[PDB]
Specification:
Leucine-rich Repeat Variant; ARM-type_fold; mainly alpha; two-stranded antiparallel ribbon; cytoplasm; 2 strands
């Protein structure tokens, strides 16, 4: 009667998991299986019958699965005798009903472990008085039983600590029972691991008894994985209980290749705990001769093996162990007197340096953080051993700055490890660039400790590159030793000199040697653009020496300005390569940096610099617009040093007059007004495309770009003297505020205000051009002229940038990309002008006649059709600086009338697109990521607009009604969105001040209904993140004691939270309703009602990647 039903089930399985079965028989079989679990009361003895070892494992995997199902749901409708019969029968399965440990399927053990762990979840807190003793006794009987016990303990700890697939009150009961008996649990795990490991040691080698070797080995693996499952979260006292004997056992396991990875992971998890400082002291035991003996022996033994998938991972693990150990030593010294410098610090530094010189790029990048923590420490940066290893570290660092080791090539021994750790040359390029940017900071931290040797090696390297001839891939290259060694030397010298002038006294600076190097790089000459860029960066790096010997100032000029006109490669026979543009750009940039950081040196030469610049501007076709306006920015930076209002005023009028004639001409005025004439001027209406006849339009859009760039530069660079006395003397102070603050006037104001109107017209036409009605007016080859650039797409999508040789590569290679870049840089540059316009000319720009209405009629014309990738730079570049740089007197004049409808539209749009996303390769995730970053920028803008404990401007906003009815729903509706980093930002900093200033209106608003659902749904959204849990509960506690003594409608949703006892709630609510603070005082009532809200706590996905989500102290191997 049951054996026939079990045969029917076996038929359902053999037709279910069969590729030959048609879908109809298959779907009906599935229905019979799920309906067997759901509809049958005799599923327990059937499932127990199917799990017999004699049956096929598949059927068994079904049977226990069925059984599992029972203890999940059908348990509720069960009797006591059925329960105890199920426990006894399942334990009989663990003791006897299991296949041989060597050949038993692992997933069978996993399902059985699911059963036992679920039965533990159900009744272990009270109904299992001797479960630990029982698991111990049954484990002692055999090896299979010990392994299964390891599975049960690991999965149990995973579910109770991380996944929380268990009633919450039972979760606290089980967690407290674990914490109480944790000494016995960890003692059992350690004793069993040591026992099975010792038996493995005694049976390491036998003639024909390998079954016990592989068996006890696998048992040791399971025990190590369970220990790794507990070490991550248990208290530190159990790790160091028996005088840290766990650490010595794990170190003894490092020599065993079959168990080394597990021991290394357990040790790494142990030393990576950022817990209580006094409990982390005994970790320093690992600096001893014994622990470092096993660690170093197993480490350099693993390196002796080739690039095998095992030895490399183990080597990474040990490297991370040494890193986290060093971070521990850095984190302990200085805070406690009992912590001292280890006796074997020198050998540790030598081995760590050996990891720094390793071919693997990953291993080299892993040590950089610990090195920075060593150099940054106050005590260890004075230890003579570290200072003794600093020269070797700097030499190895210089060796590491050269970009070599691409996985596609085979020129370096790093290429092999790069093939192991990376997918393509692009990944290796981006990773190497970032890690190099980090070793710049760590390397400077090393240079401040030994300036003499660092400057010595930098100078020697510079002389080497100036004298030595190296292979260069046309005599030009980007991957050759020439370019990579030139770049590495340039960055090294840059960091060395920068930190030198940052730390060294002026009395101890090698002026003669630095001046010598500056002369050597000024005399050096190359026709290669990239090398020329390296030379320019070396001149800008060596420039501080000019202050001691300003005689070099002419020649330096000659080196920079000549580089501005580096068209010597090709004039008109072929287009200029991207390398050339990069060189001229480096030249103009270096000129700006010189005029910005040393204005008093260039000021007496303002006449010759102005004359040479205007001689470069005499020919319109010679210089690029960015180059022209960059040199203009330099001239303005020099002009600021005049410190006289009328002088800088006259110079700016004369400088901007050519921009005034082109910008204020009625032809240009009509171009920026009519949307059709704008297209005819830019030239996007071209039906048939030919390389010729496109030049006049290029001069048109080039002239417009020149005007916009010039306005942006003059607004950005012009400034009045910092010192108030020099401001009054030069005529820059024209009044005083109501509060008594000074009033300043900018010389560029009178000129820029004449351009503001046409600028706003251009912004109007550009914002309108995104409408599909006007977008369809463009030609077919220019339908994507307003689309997002490919570099922006690959950048926001996280994918690496394309890898190309700058020496042989056109600047655009596509007229469509030239158009797209033009529209992007123009659209962003205009909002840069309006962004910097406020702080540049504050009162004269804020008192503009009908300012807010003109901005709403120019900058916010078509916000529906404007995409996200154009909206976010607008808010970050224009709105945020405009709000943050506006006084509270002019606050309600133009800030609020713009912020109201803008924030409203942001709430509506973000709500819509976020609904589209949450309702469910590179094209869709692109838009999704755009929405996410747009949400981040909106939340940051709203945050700084209202929070610095609420700021003054925030309250001045809270006076208004529209910004409140649009501000309150946004910050609290933002919690229900997937962006986790933006949730923690608004909760602790923004969401709470939004209530302390509406206490008088909260009674009239009755917003208790929307607020509690918003915060609860927001907890349901992320949940898993500990930060969002702590902050979201902090808000949940703040909104609990604030609205409960006012409304009774809180209990309408407070009781809708699942797994809630009315006795518990009413015994933690009514006692909280009455203050009784004079009777009972409590400060930590948060941890009391956290159990009252757990259906919203959220749980991470825990069916696919079980171990990685649970263990949070294991660094990713990357």
């Amino acid at each position: 009667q049951v054996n026939a039903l079990c045969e029917q089930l076996v038929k359902a399985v053999t037709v279910m998991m069969d590729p030959n079965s048609t879908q109809r028989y298959r779907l009906e079989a599935l229905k019979f299986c799920e309906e067997f679990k759901e509809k049958c009361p005799i599923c327990v003895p059937c499932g127990l019958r199917l799990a017999e070892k004699t049956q096929v494992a598949i059927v068994r995997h079904f049977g226990l699965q069925i059984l599992e199902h029972v203890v999940k749901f059908r348990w509720n409708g069960m009797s006591r005798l059925e329960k105890v019969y199920l426990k006894n029968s399942v334990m009989e399965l663990i003791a006897n009903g299991t296949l041989n440990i060597l050949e038993e399927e692992n997933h069978i053990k996993d399902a059985l472990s699911r059963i036992v762990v679920e039965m533990i979840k159900r009744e272990w807190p009270q109904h299992w008085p001797d479960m630990l003793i029982e698991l111990d006794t049954l484990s002692k009987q055999g090896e299979t039983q010990t392994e299964l016990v390891m599975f049960i303990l690991l999965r149990l700890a995973e579910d109770v600590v991380t996944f929380q697939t268990l009633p919450p009150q039972r979760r606290r009961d089980i967690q407290q029972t674990l914490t109480q008996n944790m000494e016995r649990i960890f003692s059992f795990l350690l004793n069993t691991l040591q026992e099975n490991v010792n038996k493995y040691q005694q049976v390491k080698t036998d003639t024909s008894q390998e079954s016990k070797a592989q068996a006890n080995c696998r048992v040791g693996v399971a025990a190590l994985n369970t220990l790794a499952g507990y070490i991550d979260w248990v208290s530190m006292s159990h790790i160091t209980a028996e005088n840290c004997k766990l650490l010595e056992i794990l170190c003894l396991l490092l020599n065993e290749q079959e168990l080394q990875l597990g021991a290394a992971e357990c040790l790494l998890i142990a030393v990576s705990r950022k817990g209580k400082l006094e409990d982390r002291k005994p970790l320093m035991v690992l600096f001893g001769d014994v622990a470092m003996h096993y660690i170093l022996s197993a480490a350099q033994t693993a390196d002796g093996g080739g690039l095998v998938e095992k030895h490399y991972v183990f080597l990474k693990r040990l490297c991370q162990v040494l890193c986290a150990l060093g971070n521990q030593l850095c984190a302990l010294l200085g805070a406690d007197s009992d912590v001292e410098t280890p006796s074997n610090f020198g050998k540790y530094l030598e081995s760590f340096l050996a990891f720094t010189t390793h071919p693997s790029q990953f291993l080299r990048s892993s040590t950089q953080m610990t090195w920075g923590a060593l150099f940054r420490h106050e005590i260890l940066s004075r230890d003579p051993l570290l200072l003794a290893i600093i020269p070797k570290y700097l030499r190895a660092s210089m060796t590491n700055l050269v970009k070599m080791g691409f996985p596609s090539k085979t020129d370096s021994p790093s290429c092999e490890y790069s093939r192991f750790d990376f997918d393509s040359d692009e990944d290796f390029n981006a990773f190497f660039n970032s890690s190099r940017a980090q070793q710049g900071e760590v390397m400077r931290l090393a240079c401040r400790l030994d300036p003499k040797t660092s400057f010595q090696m930098a100078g020697e390297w510079l002389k080497y590159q100036l004298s030595t001839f190296l292979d260069a891939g046309s005599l030009c290259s980007v991957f050759s030793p020439s370019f990579v060694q030139w770049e590495a030397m340039t960055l090294f010298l840059e960091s060395v000199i920068t930190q030198m002038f940052r730390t060294l006294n002026r009395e101890e600076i090698p002026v003669n040697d630095g001046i010598e190097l500056l002369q050597m790089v000024l005399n050096f000459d190359t026709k290669d653009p990239l090398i020329l860029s390296c030379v320019l960066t070396n001149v800008s790096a060596l420039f501080p020496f000019v202050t001691y010997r300003p005689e070099f100032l002419p020649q330096v000029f000659s080196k920079l300005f000549s580089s501005v006109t580096f068209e010597t490669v090709e004039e008109s026979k072929a287009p200029r390569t991207r390398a050339v543009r990069n060189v001229r750009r480096h030249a103009c940039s270096s000129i700006i940096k010189m005029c910005r950081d040393y204005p008093q040196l260039v000021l007496p030469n303002f006449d010759m610099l102005y004359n040479h610049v205007k001689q470069l501007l005499s020919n319109e076709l010679l210089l690029t617009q960015m180059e022209k306006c960059a040199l203009m920015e330099a001239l303005v930076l020099i002009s600021n040093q005049f410190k006289n209002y009328e002088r800088q005023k006259v110079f700016l009028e004369e400088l901007m007059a050519p921009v005034a004639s082109i910008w204020l001409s009625q032809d240009m005025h009509r171009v920026l007004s009519d949307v059709d004439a704008f297209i005819a001027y830019v030239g996007t209406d071209q039906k048939s495309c030919d390389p010729g006849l496109e030049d006049p339009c290029g001069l048109n859009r080039a002239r417009m770009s020149f005007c916009v760039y010039s306005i942006l530069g003059v607004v950005k660079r012009t400034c009045w003297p910092t010192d108030l006395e020099e401001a009054k003397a030069g005529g820059f102070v024209v009044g005083y505020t109501s509060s008594g603050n000074p009033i300043f006037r900018n010389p560029c104001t009178e000129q820029i205000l004449k351009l503001l109107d046409n600028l706003l017209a251009l912004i109007r036409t550009h914002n309108t051009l995104y409408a599909p009605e006007m977008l369809a007016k463009m030609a077919e080859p220019f339908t994507k002229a307003l689309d997002m650039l490919d570099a922006e797409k690959s950048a926001i999508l996280g994918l690496p940038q394309p890898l190309l040789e700058l020496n042989d590569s056109p600047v655009f290679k596509t007229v469509l990309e030239r158009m797209q870049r033009f529209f992007s840089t123009l659209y962003e540059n205009c909002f840069h002008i309006l962004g910097k316009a406020g702080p540049s000319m504050q009162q004269d720009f804020y008192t503009v006649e009908d300012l807010a209405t003109q901005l709403l009629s120019s900058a916010f014309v078509n916000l529906n059709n404007i995409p996200d990738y154009r909206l976010r730079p607008m808010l970050r570049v224009f709105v945020k600086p405009l709000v943050l740089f506006c006084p509270p007197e002019h606050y309600e004049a133009l800030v609020s009338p713009i912020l109201g409808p803008l924030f409203t539209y942001l709430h509506m749009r973000l709500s819509q697109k976020w609904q589209v996303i949450n309702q469910r390769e590179s094209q869709e995730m692109l838009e999704e990521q755009l929405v996410r970053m747009l949400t981040r920028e909106v939340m940051d803008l709203i945050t700084v607009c209202c929070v610095s404990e609420l700021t003054d401007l925030g309250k001045c906003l809270m006076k208004h009604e529209d910004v409140c009815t649009a501000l309150l729903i946004t910050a609290f509706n933002s919690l229900a969105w997937k962006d986790t980093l933006s949730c923690q930002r608004t909760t602790s900093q923004l969401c709470w001040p939004l209530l302390k200033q509406v206490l008088s209106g909260t009674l009239l608003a009755d917003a208790v209904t929307w607020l509690f659902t918003s915060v609860l749904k927001g907890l349901q959204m992320h949940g898993q993140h500990d930060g969002c849990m702590a902050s979201l509960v902090h808000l949940a506690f703040q909104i609990y004691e604030a609205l409960r003594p006012r409304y009774l409608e809180i209990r309408a949703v407070m009781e809708q939270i699942p797994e809630i006892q009315k006795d518990s709630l009413d015994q933690f609510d009514c006692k909280l309703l009455n203050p009784s603070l004079q009777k009972v005082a409590d400060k930590r009532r948060k941890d009391q009602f956290k159990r009252l809200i757990a259906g919203c706590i959220g749980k991470p996905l825990g069916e696919q990647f079980r171990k990685e989500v649970h263990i949070k102290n294991l660094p990713s191997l990357f």
